């Protein structure tokens, strides 16, 4: 049994930073990223471990598709024929499990992923506190000007974004300008949700 990661997931957790599930998700995502950066021409490798005593196993997966794009991570429907073609397009999980490769140097990016997910959890806590103390017009500072989206800043490890369709068509913003906007909903964006703000 891997007592090293077990002591970490048992001790560091339970302090509102690790909910016993996001910590395991971050650890398996970091292991997957390490295995991806280890191979040269083999991308999109995943790993799932959701048990204390149970060790982790690296099962490289392919993308089920009827085309030949990305020949390094694509598989055909004849491999799903064993399941009577039940594997619909858009879902990619099936393959034989291969040899796992654990190492102490792989913890470098693992710690980075862990602290990034802790920062994301702290951002979620700040969002919860904002919702607890919402109901007033706020001001924010823009950071970047992307396509059909801007950003807001309130320096308490918080952040907000405004959709361009909700803003004025004539007004274009620039970093350093204060923006007045009331937030109404938070959609679950990938790699962490973000508070969406609307003016119209």
């Amino acid at each position: 049994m891997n007592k090293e990661i077990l002591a970490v997931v048992e001790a560091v957790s339970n302090e509102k930073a690790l909910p016993r599930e996001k910590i395991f998700e971050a650890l398996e995502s970091a292991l997957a990223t390490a295995t991806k950066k280890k191979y040269e021409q083999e991308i999109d490798v995943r790993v799932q471990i959701d048990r204390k005593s149970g060790d982790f196993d690296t099962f490289r997966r392919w993308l089920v598709v009827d085309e030949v794009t990305q020949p390094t991570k694509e598989i055909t429907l004849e491999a799903a024929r064993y399941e009577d073609e039940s594997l619909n397009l858009g879902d990619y999980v099936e393959d034989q499990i291969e040899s796992v490769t654990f190492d102490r140097i792989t913890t470098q990016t693992a710690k980075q992923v862990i602290v990034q997910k802790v920062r994301e959890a702290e951002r979620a806590m700040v969002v919860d506190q904002f919702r607890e103390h919402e109901g007033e017009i706020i001001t924010g500072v823009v950071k970047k000007v992307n396509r059909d989206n801007i950003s807001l800043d309130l320096g308490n490890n918080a952040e907000a974004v405004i959709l361009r369709e909700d803003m004025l068509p004539r007004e274009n913003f620039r970093p350093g300008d204060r923006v007045r906007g009331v937030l109404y909903s938070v959609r679950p964006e990938a790699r962490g949700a973000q508070l969406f703000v609307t003016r119209s």
Partner: protein, 50 residues
């Protein structure tokens, strides 16, 4: 952040900004290793090879 070093001190897992500075063999030259010497400063603990 001083919290990450506490975590690094909690578990034995290595975590640092590793840069490669190993002694390599120059180009052209070759040969067979016939002797290896190791000198360690006083106080510092010796390693397996030493």
């Amino acid at each position: 952040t001083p919290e990450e070093k506490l975590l690094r001190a909690i578990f034995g897992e290595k975590a640092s900004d590793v840069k490669d500075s190993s002694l390599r063999v120059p180009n052209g030259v070759s040969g067979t290793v016939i002797d290896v010497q190791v000198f360690t400063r006083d106080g510092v603990e010796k390693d397996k090879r030493a």
